[PDB]
Ligand binder design. Structure first.
Ligand SMILES: O=P(O)(O)OC[C@H]1N[C@H](COP(=O)(O)O)[C@@H](O)[C@H]1O
Ligand SMILES: O=P(O)(O)OC[C@H]1N[C@H](COP(=O)(O)O)[C@@H](O)[C@H]1O
Ligand SMILES: Nc1ncnc2[nH]cnc12
Lengths: 169, 176
């Protein structure tokens, strides 16, 4: 986990003043360009979950649109578990639960009592992750943990969430 | 490919009148809920590419935001190749190429990062569905601006009556 995290940190590309003046953007897309690095990202999350939840079966990975889609499904398939998306309003068909930060999840996707991990690339304010948490609770599912790639500590994003949080980098 | 395609077709969930009246929405999300079905989706695309391109190395899978992100990266990793996203305007950092495409009541824009794909790279473009072809066509224009080679479009589904492939100038494979 530690050695993989160092190599993944070196792959990040910094972009000052994006999306606006004064903001320092950390781009994780170079990881996905290299199948060696991408495999290390997946392996590192897999290792964490096996360490944190050795005798608890995970039923689904719940990934946030959009950058949570880049690694969430791949992590799910590596674990042998299902993937379910949380999407922006009006994107998902059928009957959905809603949560304002608006995010949606499909009512038929996750049975009550399911154990889930929520995944996304970065946590900033925590508003998006918090909304996803509310959708999981509306499904009567269990939120074991939030898994992020990166975290902006100064923004205190964790304070909005009421389940444990792991950040890889 | 054929037997996997049948089981994947049965997993699709139809939603009439979404997002608006008269449109029939085909939801492929139930495939991703079942790791058995998801693996079959990936294996089926892998098999196709090995059959279509036995002695041509693929350098990257290029996936369209958002539903192309659901399987594109996983397909790339299964093939041992890179993944690069095509995103909506203003989302990607750094220097980007741009390509415009039309929607119902407007023109929207796609982008790709200039440093992502070297000139001469062989690429496959992937997305969930082709309807009008406008999004796929825009992605094609971004690939050509990188001076990369567009070997094929791979889609999960295709709306034949819309004639989406007529807007594209590279070969097209649709799994279902
Ligand atoms: O580009 P978007 O408007 O969809 O924002 C995406 C980003 N916002 C979230 C982090 O921000 P926050 O909700 O403040 O924690 C993540 O989903 C991250 O990918
Ligand atoms: O997210 P959007 O509202 O832009 O729509 C996404 C969907 N439309 C595209 C297909 O439509 P078209 O460009 O007409 O072929 C696909 O990317 C599919 O995922
Ligand atoms: N019928 C349809 N179902 C799902 N996505 C689409 N995008 C354009 N047409 C569509």
């Amino acid at each position: 986990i530690a050695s993989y995290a160092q190599e993944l940190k070196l792959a990040l590309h910094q972009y000052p003043n994006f999306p606006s003046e004064g903001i320092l953007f950390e781009d994780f897309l170079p990881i996905f360009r290299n199948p060696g690095l991408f495999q290390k990202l997946i392996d590192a999350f897999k290792l964490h979950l096996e360490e944190a939840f050795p005798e608890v079966k995970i039923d689904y990975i719940v990934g946030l649109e959009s950058r949570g889609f880049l690694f969430g499904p791949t992590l799910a398939l590596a674990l042998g578990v299902g993937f379910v998306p949380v999407r922006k309003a009006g994107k998902l068909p059928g009957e959905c639960f809603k949560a304002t930060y608006l995010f949606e999840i499909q009512k038929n996707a996750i049975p009550a009592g399911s154990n889930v991990i929520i995944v996304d690339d970065i946590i900033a304010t925590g508003g998006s992750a918090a909304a996803a948490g509310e959708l999981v609770e509306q499904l009567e599912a269990n939120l074991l943990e939030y898994n992020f790639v990166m975290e902006l500590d100064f923004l205190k994003g964790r304070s909005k969430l009421n389940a444990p949080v792991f950040t890889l980098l």
